[PDB]
Amino acid sequence: MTIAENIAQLIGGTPLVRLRRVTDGAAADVVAKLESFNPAGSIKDRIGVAMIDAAEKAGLIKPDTIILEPTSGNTGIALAMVSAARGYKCVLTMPDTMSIERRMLLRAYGAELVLTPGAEGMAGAIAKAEELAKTDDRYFIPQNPAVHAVTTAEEVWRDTDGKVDIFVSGVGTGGTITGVAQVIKQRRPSAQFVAVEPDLALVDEVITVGNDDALELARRMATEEGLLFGISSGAAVWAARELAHRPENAGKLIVVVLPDFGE
Amino acid sequence: GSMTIAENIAQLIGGTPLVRLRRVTDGAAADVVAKLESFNPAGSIKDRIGVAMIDAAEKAGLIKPDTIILEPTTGIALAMVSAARGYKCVLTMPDTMSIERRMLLRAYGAELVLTPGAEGMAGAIAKAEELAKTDDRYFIPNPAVHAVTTAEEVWRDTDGKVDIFVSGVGTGGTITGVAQVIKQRRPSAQFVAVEPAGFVPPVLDLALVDEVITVGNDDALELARRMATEEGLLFGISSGAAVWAARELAHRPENAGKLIVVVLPDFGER
Ligand SMILES: [Cl-]
């Protein structure tokens, strides 16, 4: 039998897909790793579950622990989902600039939201969380290559049969691109890592993406590949396509992640 | 030595995972598991129906590259697959459809033709039928193949041990197909339809269907809230009903130790 105990055990194992149409050429092959197949729709799922596992293994999370985390975006969704799966109460602080939709979704997962003022931004959210932690010692606030970067790299390695030549990605928050670069480069020194822009020790290049050449590419992806994603994913693919046409990259295998670490 | 790469997202439909429902079942002498059709690219079993229709039409030569796929509306699935495979896609739907749904379809490159709200789906089916007669570029799309595949996955992943399949009927006998296939290899297997208190509901032949449980609607809402909050599984009212039915089955003493399968999102969700 193949049966997961809970949804948090179905994080990862995401698939590669070819980008055949939007690359208009091209001497190199481009493929995308669809982190959207994760339960909560992004690579942040991996970061969330990894944080909880580590804290459990380290004894820092006891069974009556209340996960408390200042958040602004997707890390929060992942945490709420995993917390609910594993039986942890989850309290989340965020500025009141956060969309009603994100709030409702978080509340659907049983997360309790504490809204801080928009003007204070994330510092306001970090501050309230600090404050609450002092209030009650059941509160736990989450926070070389990170485990989720290792796993992600292994999947890219397996599914490209060790042939990946260029990894192309947004910088993102959780040192993910650099971790994956660490692992791939160790087994394949010829491999290149390219950050996409709208620890630079391991990045071989930075492509500042003509923002909104990005929008165009995102539109084509949706309409020509059936892949609907955001501006950062568009930029990533634009960067990959540029790399794909450079003649010194002929025949190379280029991997991009969607949704991109930027989206 | 082998790479594992799909040509396009239409190739990544299916092969969905099972998960145990440990907490919301408060008991229980029987095991309940859910097959997560939400892992499909467009989030439901309808993905399978969409791609299966396009494959059939290709195999039959009825879908040329000189086509526009036309369909009253599943619509998401079609738009996504059409765009993946290179087909122009036109969709008819009542003007009662959400602006959000419309925008999403348009993102996939689907062209929308709005029918009047009062006429409902019949209006959409009618407009589509009329359009097909208007222009010959239009193409309007046993146990069905997508029900067979779904059954095979349930069969494999439960190692042939599934005892009760529990599901909303929905429309078109995807759920009846899956029953046919399981019951054919495992005559001891039971199928239970779930209800609230060829785009119509299937006839429930009682040769196939062993029981109907009427999900005291909202009971269903309660169970949906618990799923989200106790299992991290966020789904709608019909999925809640299905799981409520499954839990009820799971506590009947004559089902002790049986393996009970539901499919989420439940085929009856809106
Ligand atoms: Cl090589």
Give the chain A residue nearest B160 (alpha carbons): A1
In the residue annotation, A190 being an active-site residue is answered as no
Catalytic member of A42, A83, A169, A232: A232
Can you read off the two tokens belonging to residue A137? 């010692």
Inter-chain touch B20–A6, beta carbons under 8 Å: yes
Closest CA of chain A from B137, distance in Å:
20
Residue of B19, B31, B25 whose CA lies nearest to B161: B31
d(CA A127, CA B21): 37
Centre a 10 Å sphere on the Cβ of residue B76 and count the other Cβ atoms it contains. Answer: 23
Contact B231 A84 (CB under 8 A): yes
Q: Are the beta carbons of B70 and B90 closer than 8 angstroms?
A: yes
Domain of residue B246, CATH code: 3.40.50.1100
Q: Determine how β-strand A66-70 pairs with β-strand A139-140.
A: parallel
Whether B35 and B108 map to the same domain: the answer is no
The rounded distance, in Å, linking the Cα atoms of B216 and B222 is 11
Structure tokens at B191: 């199928």
Q: Are residues B137 and B187 located together in one domain of the fold? A: no
Q: Are residues B49 and B93 in the same domain?
A: yes
Ligand 1 centroid distance, CA of A252 (Å)? 9
Chain A residue nearest residue B22, CA to CA: A5
Q: Which residue of B has its CA nearest to A37?
A: B39
Q: Are B5 and A16 in contact (CB under 8 A)?
A: yes
List of long-range contacts for B13-16, beta carbons under 8 Å, 24+ apart: B13/B40, B13/B41, B13/B47, B13/B48, B13/B50, B13/B51, B13/B81, B14/B40, B14/B47, B14/B48, B14/B149, B14/B150, B14/B153, B15/B153, B16/B40, B16/B153
Contact yes or no for B18 and A5 at CB 8 A: no
Which residue of chain A has the CA closest to B38? Answer: A39
Residues B83 and B153 in one domain: no
A107 touches chain B (CB under 8 A): no
- Give the closest residue to A140 by CA, choosing from A189, A86, A96: A86
Q: How many helices (H) and strands (E) does chain A have?
A: 8, 11
Same domain, B5 and B63: no
Cα→Cα distances A190→A27, A163, A166, A204, B229, Å: 18, 10, 9, 11, 47
Q: Which amino acid is at B235?
A: F
Query: Which domain covers residue A53, as residue numbers?
Result: 38-142
Q: Do B34 and B151 belong to one domain?
A: yes
Which among B4, B5, B13, B54 is the top mutation candidate for probing chain A, defined by the most A β-carbons within 10 Å of its own β-carbon? B5
Rounded to a whole number of angstroms, the distance from the CA of A174 to the nearest CA of chain B is 23
- Among B94, B111, B141, the domain boundary falls at B141
Pick A1's closest partner by Cβ from B157, B228, B232. B157
A10: chain B residues, CB-CB within 8 Å = 17, 19, 36, 39
| DSSP strand pairing (B111-115 vs B190-196) | unpaired
Same structural domain for residues B22 and B155? yes
The single-letter DSSP state of residue A73 is: S
Which residues does chain A have within 8 Å of residue B82's beta carbon, measured at their own beta carbons?
226
Q: Are residues A186 and A258 in the same domain?
A: yes
Local structure of A203: helix, strand or coil: coil
Q: Minimal CA–CA distance to B93: which of B128, B67, B49, B50?
A: B128
**Is A44 a known active-site residue?**
yes
Q: Is B221 on the interface with A (CB under 8 A)?
A: no
Mark whether B256 and B184 lie in a shared domain. Answer: yes
Domain total for chain B?
A: 2
Same domain, residue pair A85 and A119: yes
Choosing from B89, B112, B141, the residue where a domain stops is: B141
Write the residue in A17, A82, A160 that is nearest to B6 by C-beta.
Answer: A17
Q: C-alpha angle with apex B43: B42 to B44, nearest 5 degrees? A: 105
Q: A146 Cβ partners below 8 Å, 6+ apart?
A: A50, A174, A175, A176, A179
Residues of A in contact with B33 (CB under 8 A): 3
Same domain? For B200 and B150 the reply is: yes
Q: What's this structure's resolution in Å?
A: 2.6
Residues A157, A251: one domain? yes
* Subunit contact B84:A5, Cβ cutoff 8 A: no
Q: Name the experiment that determined this structure.
A: X-ray
| B81 in contact with chain A, both atoms CB, cutoff 8 A | yes
Helices assigned H by DSSP within A87-120? 100-108
Is B171 annotated as belonging to a binding site? yes
Among candidate residues B86, B117, B141, the one where a domain is terminated: B141
Phi, psi of B205 (to 5 degrees): -65, 130
B82 is in an annotated binding site: no
Q: Is the dihedral of CA A141, A147, A151, A157 positive or negative?
A: positive
